[PDB]
Write a protein that binds this DNA or RNA. Structure first.
Lengths: 127, 201, 226, 25, 97, 91, 96, 150
RNA sequence: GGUGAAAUUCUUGGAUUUAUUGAAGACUAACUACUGCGAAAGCAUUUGCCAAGGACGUUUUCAUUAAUCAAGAACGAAAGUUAGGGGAUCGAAGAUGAUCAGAUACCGUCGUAGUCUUAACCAUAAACUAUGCCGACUAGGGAUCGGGUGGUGUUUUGACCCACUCGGCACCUUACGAGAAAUCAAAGUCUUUGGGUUCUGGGGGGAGUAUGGUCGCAAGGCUGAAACUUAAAGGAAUUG
């Protein structure tokens, strides 16, 4: 009826990954990031760059035979931010508007229980 | 004499003719006179027993492990030394172990071993104050003491000898293809200097 | 960026998808819906095989999809390919875990949190680790603004939960345990026993994960697919 | 100057007076 | 002089309180002194809700939510307009906005 | 009376061999010339023969052990562990 | 607590400490109970058991060595086995 | 307040204003002395005799019925302990902490608690040497205290 | 990858990203609070073992055994020291890229000692409530932790609910009162000056420096001057 894959969106500050995989997760189908749609480093995290990227995985996915995908939204996590970056919402919006059906949505950032030490020192980034 | 760890004379009973047979073992800590020692495939898990490596659980600490079944002891025989057991491989009849040096091996499950840690530990943490106490140590080991330095010799004697000062003149690190008479120094040295950091084993 | 690549190589094309195929995933018979999706693999060349790559890749699904109702949509199931039969794969139970969103919504402040984990082996020689969670609930006609519990209460609650879990997991096989988790029976067990100690809300089996497996026997697997 | 770094300076001064005097003793 | 009767924290009857790290500048501040907020937001932002409903392979699919608890040090709490300087009489107020 | 304030047993070594090496030896000599408990008979009569050999005059029993004490910290850990593994695997 | 029952027997009743006094008591039928230290050797412990089988007296294995059994009976020396002859004002025989 | 802490609890018993035995008490005074003596004959300390006599028999307190305090009855008959009963319990508790420390030498709190207990032992034995209930030169030596209790 | 923007760096010999699996060390999130325990420093996963402690209840026992302390002693964050083990993260030193007039600083990436454990030293802090300990008395109001009493209250005495009491962590209002004020239920019951007791200070610098002791392996800790100099330093509020 519907052929299902999985879409993993890694919305970080400084970049955003959009790539689709099989349901099992061992075979990748289309990967494209925000850094292959812009020409300046400060724009790799913009909504526009993520939006252009998502339209490309939509292109490749259709031509491999996929019509629907689940969603796994992530941020750096661990000792890092744990907050979605700017490009996460643009990517999810772009996939929907490209006629690629959407199933379940879930957040999968690695939350560390209580963890190893965090960088920056005791006084933090003095800036 | 010449051996740091004590020995233990366990006397078994000959199962094919009427007599006794005495065997020399290397004692593990806690082994006292009058103790019964059980060796076999179906012995208990107590200090002093000889069991195959495949008949003990992970984390067991053994000693005098034979690296093939029947060598009669190879791997942990100095004082204070032992061997840890990491895992089992039923489908290949093998067991993984950690050696004193930090290396991992795979040996047959049928390889035997004794349970515990070799006796007489802590030996090398007391200084030898006097040259007399090194004199008597090697007097029952062999002729390897005193040691003269190569750089205090003439060039006829050692590669390092000779010169108006005492110095080598070439790198002390020597290739592994070197021949007899050339290998003097750090042979096949992967690095050199004061060891700072993690071992990264 | 587009033009910030310094060197392409450390030294001085065939379309991949022209050489793949789709297999069909089949769930074990404990669940109503047997179809879950499809997956890819390169075709079996002479020197390689498709089976050696189709084995062991895990597929994460939702119990709602395997049972037909989206009221069961906050649990997830994992399945592991154990055998390749023609063009369709056959899988087996592997674990279960809540969704991240569901778990976090349960943990509000002004209430104590009770957890219990038990390592037990089923009757067919699998080893499992079963995790449980619970909370304490503000009672009707309560004026006090929080519903904490003394450590005397929490220790007893954690003793009852552990024993019901050991009992219900051993004495039953892994398929039976799976069929027992779906109706959420174990929750009713826990509360009927803990009620006299402290009122609780949100009793759940948070996750179950396998630690070891018995020697593979094909005939046993077929019983859940025929 | 900051009280903390004045303490440090005085300490480094004493450490040196402690070794110049050790030549005579 | 003494500015606050709580010393700018919430420690009474306690010797020590273990610290946490700010989320913006990575600095250690005792738990009882840190400024703490909870940010709960639908995963799919408001402007995208219509497209996702039209794209859902289900009817009546409830939007999942994202939860996190954020810790700020005083310096980064002032800057991010989470808290603002407040007058003498108005400092004593405890009731949220 | 207190004949030496801090050289103790090692006073025999004179002004020789540096202070650090005499402190180190003092720690272990005091361990190897002490008397311990023979748990088999309650008496405190366990001396040291050679290295690693601990003998008691009362029973004529000998117990293998450390070079300078009856029991080392490493052996004890193994003893408790083996009690746990044996009492855990016999099930 | 066993120790509190031992103390009352020592103060009120009568007893015999030591190995050779115990065997004499068991042989004459006088003994009512015998209390063996944890670390009494395996051979001697067995010898005491067989005698008690013949005289039909009870055996209680104390949880401590010679030093601990002695301080339980309040003697500065170490006792390896104690035999009760009259209970005095304690309920040791009819309890435990 | 407390001698060796910051506690300031005021909990305690409150004996009746009336020094006369309650009207519903009927068993004789000499009969009650029989209860005391046979209880001490089986080891119970003066404190334990009263508790067992209060909530099983009607004796509100021996002073009101018999005419003498429990301790003063015991000593007259010859059952008096060798050392007072409150000192006996401080020593018994010092033995237990010392035995615990021999096994756990990193228990820096049990060491501190032991200092406080032994301090209480000395402050009390001094009181007893002044009123001449303990012979002068009585000394609590740690290495030997185990003998005293048992 | 990184930033406000970038560069060093890694990448067609496949980096970044996705899956499955395994090893090592550290840590103990969310629940977490104007809540709990401890002499203070401090203490947060499960269970077993060892010893200990406050409050409460008591028609138990002793009968002044008490309060506070020069000298003396136990414990004493982090960093630091000596020898084994471990060494994943972060990171004094060091090395690098960038900003800059300079940047041997802040920012970016590496990284030794350290971080963790055993044995043994040190004895310090904004070790703070900048507030010594024991005792009695003096104003109003609510919330919470432990224990006890009354309510057969109500749901199905465990959980709640109402009233009372003892012991704590605190909080709101007020000025009989105190204060130089800020403020304070103790910092009140002190010119109407006396409940018991211990410790410390005498304008600012020189100076917690020199010297003599004593403790420590070392870093250093405790005790601690004089010549000389100077009319002000300082506390809380008021208007700019």
């Amino acid at each position: 009826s519907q052929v299902f894959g999985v879409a993993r969106i890694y919305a970080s500050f400084n970049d955003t990954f959009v790539h689709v995989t099989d349901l099992s997760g061992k075979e990748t189908i289309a990967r494209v990031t925000g850094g292959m749609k812009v020409k300046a480093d400060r724009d790799e995290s913009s909504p526009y760059a993520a939006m252009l990227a998502a339209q490309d995985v939509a292109a490749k996915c259709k031509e491999v035979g996929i019509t629907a995908v689940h969603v796994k939204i992530r941020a750096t996590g661990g000792t890092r931010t744990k907050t979605p970056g700017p490009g996460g919402q643009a990517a999810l919006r772009a996939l929907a508007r490209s006629g690629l059906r959407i199933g379940r949505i879930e957040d999968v950032t690695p939350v560390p229980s209580d963890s190893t030490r965090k960088k920056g020192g005791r006084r933090g980034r003095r800036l | 004499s010449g051996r740091g760890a004590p020995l233990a004379k366990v006397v078994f009973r000959d199962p094919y003719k009427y007599r006794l047979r005495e065997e020399i073992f290397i004692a593990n800590e806690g082994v006292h006179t009058g103790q019964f020692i059980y060796a076999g495939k179906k012995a208990s898990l107590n200090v002093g027993n000889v069991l195959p490596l495949g008949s003990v659980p992970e984390g067991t600490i053994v000693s005098n492990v034979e690296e093939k079944p029947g060598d009669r002891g190879a791997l942990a025989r100095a004082s204070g030394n032992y061997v840890i057991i990491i895992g089992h491989n039923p489908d290949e009849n093998k067991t993984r172990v950690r050696l004193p040096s930090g290396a991992k091996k795979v040996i047959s499950s049928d390889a035997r071993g004794v349970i515990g840690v070799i006796a007489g530990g802590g030996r090398v943490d007391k200084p030898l104050l006097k040259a007399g106490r090194a004199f008597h140590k090697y007097r029952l080991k062999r002729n390897s003491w005193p040691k003269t330095r190569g750089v205090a010799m003439n060039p006829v004697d050692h590669p390092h000898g000779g010169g108006n000062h005492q110095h080598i003149g070439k790198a002390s690190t020597i290739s592994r293809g070197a021949v007899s008479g050339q290998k003097a120094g750090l042979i096949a040295a992967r690095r050199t200097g004061l060891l700072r950091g993690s071992q990264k084993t | 960026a587009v033009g910030k690549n310094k060197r392409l190589s450390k030294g001085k094309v065939v379309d991949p998808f022209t050489r793949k195929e789709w297999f069909d995933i089949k769930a074990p018979s404990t669940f109503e819906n047997r179809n879950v999706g499809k997956t890819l693999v390169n075709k079996s060349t002479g020197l390689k095989s498709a089976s050696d790559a189709l084995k062991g890749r895990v597929v994460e699904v939702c119990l709602a999809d395997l049972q037909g109702s989206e009221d069961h949509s906050f649990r997830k199931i994992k399945l592991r390919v154990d055998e390749v039969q023609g063009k369709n794969l056959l899988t087996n139970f592997h674990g279960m875990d809540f969704t991240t969103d569901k778990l976090r919504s349960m943990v509000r402040k002004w209430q104590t949190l009770i957890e219990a984990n038990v390592t037990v082996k089923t009757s067919d020689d699998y080893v499992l680790r079963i995790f449980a969670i619970a909370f304490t609930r503000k009672q009707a006609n309560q004026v006090k603004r929080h519903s904490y519990a003394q450590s005397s209460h929490i220790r007893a609650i954690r003793k009852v939960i552990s024993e019901i879990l050991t009992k219900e997991v051993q004495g039953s096989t892994l398929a039976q345990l799976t069929s027992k988790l779906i109706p959420e029976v174990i929750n009713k067990e826990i509360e009927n026993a803990t009620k006299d100690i402290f009122p609780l809300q949100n009793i759940h089996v948070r996750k179950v994960k396998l630690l070891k497996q018995p020697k593979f026997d094909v005939g046993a697997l077929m019983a859940l697919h025929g | 100057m900051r009280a903390k770094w004045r303490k440090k300076r005085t300490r480094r001064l004493k450490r040196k007076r402690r070794k110049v005097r050790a030549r005579s003793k | 002089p003494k500015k606050r009767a709580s010393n700018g924290r919430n420690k009474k009857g306690r010797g020590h309180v273990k610290p946490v790290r700010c989320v913006n500048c990575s600095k250690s501040i005792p738990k009882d002194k840190a400024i703490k907020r909870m940010a709960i937001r639908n995963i799919v932002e408001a402007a995208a809700v219509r497209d996702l409903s039209e794209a859902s392979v289900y009817p009546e699919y409830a939007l999942p939510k994202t939860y996190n608890k954020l810790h700020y040090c005083v310096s980064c709490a002032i800057h991010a307009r989470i808290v603002r300087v407040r007058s003498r009489e108005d400092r004593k107020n405890r009731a949220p906005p | 009376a207190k004949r030496t304030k801090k050289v103790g047993i090692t006073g025999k070594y004179g002004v020789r061999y540096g202070s650090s090496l005499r402190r180190q030896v003092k720690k272990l000599e005091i361990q190897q010339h002490a008397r311990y408990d023979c748990s088999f008979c309650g008496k405190k009569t366990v001396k040291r023969g050679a290295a690693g050999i601990w003998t008691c005059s009362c029973c004529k029993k000998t117990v293998a052990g450390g070079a300078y004490t009856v029991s080392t910290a490493a052996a004890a850990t193994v003893r408790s562990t083996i009690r746990r593994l044996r009492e855990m695997v016999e099930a | 607590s066993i120790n509190q029952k031992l103390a009352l027997v020592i103060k009120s009743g009568k007893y015999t400490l030591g190995y050779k006094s115990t065997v004499k008591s068991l042989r004459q039928g006088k003994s009512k109970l015998i209390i063996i230290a944890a670390n009494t050797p395996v051979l001697r412990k067995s010898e005491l058991e067989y005698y008690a089988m013949l005289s039909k007296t009870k055996v209680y294995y104390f949880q401590g060595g010679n030093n601990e059994l002695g301080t339980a009976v309040g003697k500065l020396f170490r006792v390896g086995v104690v035999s009760i002859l009259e209970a005095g004002d304690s309920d040791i025989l009819t309890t435990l | 307040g407390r001698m060796h802490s910051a506690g300031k609890g005021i909990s305690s018993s409150a004996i009746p204003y009336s020094r006369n035995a309650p009207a519903w008490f009927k068993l004789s005074s000499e009969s009650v002395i029989e209860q005391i003596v046979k209880y001490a004959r089986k080891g119970l300390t003066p404190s334990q005799i009263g508790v067992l006599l209060r909530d099983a028999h009607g004796v509100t307190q021996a002073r009101v019925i018999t005419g003498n305090k429990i301790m003063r009855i015991l000593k007259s008959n010859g059952l008096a302990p060798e050392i007072p009963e409150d000192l006996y319990y401080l020593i018994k508790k010092a033995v237990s902490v010392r035995k615990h420390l021999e096994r756990n030498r990193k228990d820096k709190d049990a060491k501190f608690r032991l200092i406080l207990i032994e301090s209480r032992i000395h402050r009390l034995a001094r009181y007893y040497r002044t009123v001449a209930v303990l012979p002068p030169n009585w000394k609590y030596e740690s290495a030997t205290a185990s003998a005293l209790v048992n």
